[PDB]
Design a protein around this ligand. Structure first.
Ligand SMILES: CN1C[C@H](Nc2cnn(C)c(=O)c2Br)C[C@H](c2ccccc2)C1
Length: 103
């Protein structure tokens, strides 16, 4: 229970972060050419929110695996110096630093 209690804290903190704007909602493949071809397993914060809401996280490791998938997919598709990429690095570093502050 305290496992998923820390996940609520960090997801709420990521949900409200300045640099979270590329990750609050699923990428729209109709708007992003080549996205479905390149990104096999899309992931985003609202999908993690939904899954946390309906209780579909058994351990805290599953939650972190979805979070890292967001920034993996981000680095796979965007240049590090693009504006999404820049936001993803800020968000990736935030997540790891907060995650280690508990574990
Ligand atoms: C849903 N969400 C997905 C988009 N995130 C993106 C867009 N393009 N690429 C290549 C990505 O990797 C991501 Br994540 C950002 C979009 C938006 C948000 C704010 C302002 C402009 C666009 C709204």
């Amino acid at each position: 229970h305290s496992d998923l209690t820390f996940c609520e804290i960090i997801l709420m903190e990521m949900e409200s972060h300045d640099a979270a704007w590329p990750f609050l909602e699923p990428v729209n493949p109709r708007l992003v050419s080549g996205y479905r071809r390149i990104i096999k397993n899309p992931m985003d914060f609202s999908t993690m929110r939904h899954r946390l809401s309906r209780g579909g996280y058994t351990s805290s490791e599953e939650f972190a695996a979805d979070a890292l998938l967001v920034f993996d997919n981000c680095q796979t598709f965007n240049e590090d110096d693009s504006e999404v990429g820049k936001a993803g690095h800020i968000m990736r570093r935030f997540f790891e630093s907060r995650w280690e502050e508990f574990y």
